[PDB]
Subunit: 606 residues, 3 copies
């Protein structure tokens, strides 16, 4: 006579299957396997970069400031009518006999200006040899020497225009700088020089560039310089180039072009540079600098490189030094040092290696080193793409390694679990089966197979319980589970059955049991429970009350949340530009406006 | 009489529950679901950047080196008193009638210097028209032409000051360069020119900038140039600007400002630029370059951009060329090309797309393209923040995708597992229950629920076994499990029970069994085993001996270890700066020290 | 008489074990635990960088363009013989009495040139005081003023050489710029000045650098400037430096060196800068800029820094302003502001913090702030290594956090699973055991242990079934499972047994069963099934037919695929260089070729 308290569930009549429909538990699947593991070859690496450093060398300038001053005299004053200042070369001979020999210098200048030979006499007086005194010391200045420090104008002869000459033999060490092709260089003064620093006579150095005549250059063999301050003769000789331009006479110690120059610079040395082979490329991993390189499989011809001899010396010099401190007692060099080109344009020198362990493998890999086998290379300033490559790769693996491993433990588990479901199905088919089919049913074991038949739904408001459970027709023998009556649909007849497990509606009431004392049980009725006390209904219940426990194992996985990368520079191109103390462009844009701003440019009088 | 060998464990008396405390297995939880999946719209993209390239064009300089030389003669020598060198413009008329027509040039100069008109005659001789010969070929030099190559000084008249003039009409092609606003430009020589290259008369070009008078500029219409070397007349005419500065006469072919100029440069072309919508922004993914862009939802007005017409031509020119080689047979353009602004300042042109597949969706998305709808933009040099954005995002997903998927397989598993625990509990409640409650207990099935009662601990040193298992009161009927006696506490009475499963202390000995031959068994006693042989104790044991097998499935997960990112530049700002051959600042800092170092600056004589 | 249809499997005879070999289920392992969780200390941070900005200040130039022109007159024309132009300083006195007082200027120049005092008179006429008019307005130009705008040449006296003087007192405001050590600076004009801007007399400013005499510098105390355009006297006084170089007289308002200068620049302000302690270093995480810093544990002495006072003011000024808008009501400053040095060279100022929550912890951490306790620092331009560090770390954790958590849920699961396998083994040992041992066997429970004995293989082509299952010797009592006969090897005798579960060959046929109606079953025979209908063979079968269901739970894990990072720059070093309008190097390389190209350099006549 008693209904249900909560109807947020559904009942099901489970008529035994006939065998019509038959299923089977899916057999174990085949589990994936971890890759054979990447093979990393050890090897010392050296990375060269496009040398943007100008070739630098030292030199010395020899010239004479020639200044002629004209003056007009007044009754109680005077004025410069014109100061015509000029700068003349110190003839080759004077540079050797006077300056280099005795630290002296002629009081005259003698050179060619405007297709003509002029001659200046200091103070318009007879010629003399004057000693060279050091120039005034100044903050951050190369060494400088000169003849006199006082100019010379005409002696007073009132109401007249007189002329006065001033000669100052100046010599100072400067810094010259040349760039590829090295067919011309510049001094610290700004004076350009249109000859190769490597020009000369010895050893084919005469095919170097010169835009000058032949009587201007004079290479001196076996040359000992006499310092102009300490006055000491050089202990060793040099081959000395001496060029004489219309404005000055440069000189410098001649050296060969190939050894003194190189279009590449040793940039990064790497102890451990892992080399691997991925789909027709080599990945040079450097854990140290966090950088991975991508190259081709075949080497790169050094001979194809324009002026790149330092590379050889530079590289080997390092691979030896490293092999020493490190590989001297653990590894061995494999094949000769190899050279490959990387994306962006970084030249990489490599020396494959093997530990004393795998000594037995030398033979094979040695061949693999040999199977690897006039312009200039352009390199990028940004090495981020590689560190991205490195960082991404480094992570691409771990994630896939761990997640890959996980995948396998899983497959093995599901297959491993089958064992249990198999046993469980025999025990409680109606329960195990349902889950598996996805729908609520009833099933039986036709040997080694299952045969299922669906269970018909029944609303809860169509279910009644009997206030008792005792049998009178068999006293001392009651039912193990509560008695109930139910309805199909709403207007259909009323049926009676015995309450089963998990709201099954059993058509039979053969689940009998010899009555006993201390009989107390809870039976899942509706969306909750029904507590019968001593073979008699007591009251229903919600599932909330009954203390809940868990067969589930928890796992708290949050997701990785978004993040914005703000554009960030340490120094903007604006700062970088501003940093410069002087700006040529600005200086000219300003200075060249002078006559527009401060003067009249078109006005003419007659 | 026999104790235990190992006492690193604990015993438990498990008195049947009364039903007082009752629990229930937690019901299946609800499993999360993978997001609906991100919607990526295909589209061809073009990315423009702040054009830092100066506007560049070609021109030609017309001037005359005017040099007056004064000389003093001696008995056996001579000297330059003053060489006053000047540089004069070639008047507009002469540039057309003499130079352009016949490759000739006047032997005179005629111009205004210092608010006055001066006239120089070459060699101080009557005027002439002289032909223009090519200048001496030099390494890397623009074309140059001139009149004469020999200077001119006065003929000898001993003991006198004489005057000599030298005129050299020089013409040479130079490279001019202008920057925004393009109201002035510079020549390859360093000479500034304070007029817009776009100045002129035609089509409002007269509102361009000029800091000069009107008689200095002269635009020539229908202009055919006669090459000075090949002597050939141009086949096509140009509008020719001719400005005459106090120092020289520039000239160049006039062109419009808007088409010839643009404040942006087509930088990167992208075939596949995925566009997505995340919380009020568009993420432009380029797999190719590894770069993701962040923009607003509404477009950006090109009209708002200052001088940006090339952008239009540039963009479309590309989206067509790409759509051709690629999208010609697979996709279709959606709406008009759209323009959005990205962080950092990269202008992005986009052309949304759809494959022939989803042709039925054109209508809707077309509107979504239209719903999208005078200064200059500043762009950063660093595109790393984006490649970080890209790289991070690319990984942020996979990890969350896979780990997300995992989470779900888990929830489903635990719920799936419940089925088993349910069956297992009926079988062996005391075992299944314990694990679940967390503590060791005993339990019974009060229908569809569990009722538990704790088990009291018993030290191992308080446990004794009987050397036998045979019953005399029922011969041919022994016990299935060993006999034992135990103690509560240490000083308490001694109790007798039957050994149960996993060290349970059963209060009853009703586990009887008809004796049999070949009876041999191991029973978990203490921290090990007790091997009874033929219903009689034989000896205890440690668990070590018994071959162990595993129900567990292994998973080896290591963690991702730290890594340091060393600061790494390919070229330091120091190198970058050094690379430059000449440094204006250095040159001036040095040169301007001259008089301090090598001369006397305050000394005065009278 | 009937064989098998499919033989892609194997049969096994499973003779009961004797107890010889005995095993045991591995006991639960100990599960790892998540780390105690990283402790992050909140704190406001400010990051300074190597200041590459030149020190900038304003000044004013005072000079006089002195121009002497000489002309020769002809019958119908004239010419400049020589224009000797010079530039003279405006004496200290004139700068105060004439220019600053009345906006006037002397019509004469009076200075020292070439160790001699010259005197120029404008127009060669008596001295005058001339007013200073503004210079012609020009695009983007500092203020300029001058005396006259018309030059002056000699009046016509035909057939003669006459002389004319021109003096133009010019004054213009320029921008000076100095760099460390700030012992010299330059003007906007390009004129260098070899004195420290901080030189003076007051407060030890006389130990600053000067390469000049003492009569050239003149610091004026209590100085009010009278604007030359508005003519207004300054409302406040300044200490005014006035240096007089041979070419011009600079002047500027003197200021102290330490406050006006600093070798570092406040670069990035960070509200939330997480500070953590990892193996002897601090990691400064800024979520905002995506950047993590690495420093030492002990602070860095500011006193050790050369000229770094602005840092103090700059830093605190910010930490206060932030603490205001934010920490004013939630946190509290902990200890004094601390300073540490980071890799690459970024100075970081930090102010540790605690929320009002953990107020009780102030005491301890305060000490930890104190336990933390003349050159210049070099900073890198690339901040990518840090954003890599940040990005990598940020991900290194999540992956390890989640995957770590996973590992634990696993261990707990396997141990949790043991419970089930334990129950399952009792039920079906032959099944549960096999899986566990890895090989197919049969086993029995010797109490609390297992005893196994292998099962011998039997080819399928050696297996026959009986067309029926009914017993005649016991009518109304048949077998539950099909009858079969089999062979060991190929030539061995024929044995008879009863079909068991999963192709076991039972030696006994005691699995009898009282015959029943509606008997229909499938028995796994060979690689498929055998369907007996009513105790009689009907036909074999393949496993394909029988509807398959799954006990396995799916998990779809793909791997993270490779990706190439193309080298990518926004502006190449080539563009960066090109961008510059003028290039000094180019200008000189070109200009200095002049005489080679356009003239004769060696030819001499006599
Ligand atoms: C790497 O080397 C191992 C043995 O050293 C070898 O078994 C394996 O084949 C190699 N890796 C690959 C991908 O072939
Ligand atoms: C490697 O060789 C291929 C084929 O010549 C070429 O396309 C590719 O650019 C090369 N890679 C590098 C790093 O230059
Ligand atoms: C995670 O789930 C919740 C917190 O979100 C909590 O109830 C549970 O105990 C947590 N599990 C573990 C072990 O982290
Ligand atoms: C993406 O498109 C699909 C169908 O094309 C749609 O079902 C889904 O709603 C869209 N994504 C989101 C997040 O709405
Ligand atoms: C997008 O619009 C918002 C609102 O005007 C603005 O704050 C933000 O700066 C814009 N984003 C970009 C990329 O400029
Ligand atoms: C991982 O665990 C250990 C090695 O740490 C080893 O005993 C076991 O076999 C490994 N499992 C697998 C399958 O990697
Ligand atoms: C971090 O702080 C917590 C309490 O605030 C403490 O228990 C823990 O020991 C600290 N972390 C470490 C690694 O010691
Ligand atoms: C920190 O101190 C150690 C020991 O003096 C030193 O080697 C290291 O370079 C320092 N770190 C930094 C950031 O300079
Ligand atoms: C994943 O496995 C396959 C697709 O590869 C499919 O049959 C299955 O349904 C998928 N499982 C889930 C839930 O993603
Ligand atoms: O470029 C010439 C080369 O020698 C230098 O850069 C390095 O030594
Ligand atoms: O033309 C030179 C002018 O611009 C100033 O530099 C003079 O000091
Ligand atoms: O800046 C002017 C523009 O035309 C060039 O940069 C590219 O063509
Ligand atoms: O003032 C010019 C001096 O610095 C040298 O460049 C001369 O060669
Ligand atoms: O370098 C001097 C300093 O004061 C400036 O860079 C910032 O104010
Ligand atoms: O020597 C100056 C020449 O190179 C040109 O700049 C003249 O206009
Ligand atoms: Na003489
Ligand atoms: Na004449
Ligand atoms: Na006079």
């Amino acid at each position: 006579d008693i209904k249900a308290e909560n109807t947020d569930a559904n009942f099901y009549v489970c008529p035994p299957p006939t065998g019509a429909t038959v299923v089977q538990f899916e057999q174990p699947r085949r589990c994936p396997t971890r890759p054979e593991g990447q093979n990393y070859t050890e090897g010392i690496a050296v990375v060269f970069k496009e040398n943007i450093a100008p070739y630098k060398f030292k030199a010395t300038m020899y010239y004479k400031d020639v200044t002629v001053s004209q003056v007009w005299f007044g009754h109680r004053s005077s004025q410069f009518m014109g100061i015509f200042e000029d700068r003349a070369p110190v003839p080759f001979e004077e540079v050797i006999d006077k300056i280099n020999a005795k630290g002296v210098c002629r009081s005259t200048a003698k050179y060619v200006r405007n297709n003509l030979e002029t001659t200046a006499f200091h103070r318009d007086d007879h010629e003399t040899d004057m000693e060279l005194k050091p120039a005034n010391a100044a903050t951050r200045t190369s060494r400088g020497w000169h003849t006199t420090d006082l100019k010379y104008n005409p002696s007073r002869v009132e109401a007249f225009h007189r002329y006065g000459t001033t000669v100052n033999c100046i010599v100072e060490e400067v810094d010259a700088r040349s760039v590829y092709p090295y067919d011309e260089f510049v001094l610290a003064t700004g004076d350009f020089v249109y000859m190769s620093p490597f020009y000369g006579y010895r050893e084919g150095s005469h095919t170097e560039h010169t835009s000058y005549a032949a009587d201007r250059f004079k290479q001196v063999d076996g040359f000992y310089a006499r310092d102009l301050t300490t006055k000491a003769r050089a202990t060793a000789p040099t081959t000395r180039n001496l060029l004489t331009t219309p404005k000055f006479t440069v000189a410098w110690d001649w050296v060969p072009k190939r050894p003194s120059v190189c279009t590449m610079t040793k940039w990064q040395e790497v102890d451990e540079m892992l080399r691997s082979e991925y789909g027709g490329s080599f990945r040079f991993s450097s854990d140290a600098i966090s950088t991975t390189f991508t190259t081709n499989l075949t080497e790169y011809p050094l001979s194809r490189v324009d002026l790149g001899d330092c590379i050889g010396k530079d590289a080997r010099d390092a691979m030896d030094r490293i092999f020493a401190r490190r590989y001297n007692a653990t590894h061995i060099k494999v094949g000769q040092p190899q050279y490959y080109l990387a994306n962006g344009g970084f030249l990489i020198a490599y020396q494959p290696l093997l530990s004393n362990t795998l000594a037995e493998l030398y033979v094979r890999e040695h061949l693999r080193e040999q199977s690897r086998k006039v312009e200039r290379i352009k390199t990028t300033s940004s090495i981020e793409f590689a560190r991205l490559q490195f960082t991404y790769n480094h992570i691409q693996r771990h994630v896939n390694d761990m997640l890959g491993r996980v995948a396998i433990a899983w497959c093995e588990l599901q297959n491993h679990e089958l064992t249990l479901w198999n046993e469980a199905r025999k025990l409680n088919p109606n329960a195990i089966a349902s889950v598996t089919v996805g729908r609520r049913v009833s099933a039986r074991m036709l040997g080694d197979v299952m045969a299922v038949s669906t269970c018909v739904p029944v609303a809860a408001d169509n279910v009644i319980v009997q206030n008792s459970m005792r049998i009178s027709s068999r006293p001392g023998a009651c039912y193990s589970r509560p008695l109930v009556s139910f309805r199909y649909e709403d207007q259909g007849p009323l049926v009676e059955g015995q309450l089963g497990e998990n709201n099954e509606l059993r058509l039979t009431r053969d689940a009998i049991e010899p009555c006993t004392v201390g009989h107390r049980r809870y039976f899942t009725f509706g969306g909750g429970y029904v507590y019968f006390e001593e073979y008699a209904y007591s009251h229903q219940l919600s599932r909330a009350d009954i203390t809940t426990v868990s067969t589930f194992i928890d796992l708290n996985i949050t997701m990785l949340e978004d993040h914005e990368f703000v554009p960030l520079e340490v120094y903007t191109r604006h700062e970088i530009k501003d940093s410069g103390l002087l700006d040529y462009t600005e200086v000219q844009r300003r200075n060249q406006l002078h006559d527009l701003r401060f003067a009249d440019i078109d006005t003419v009088i007659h």
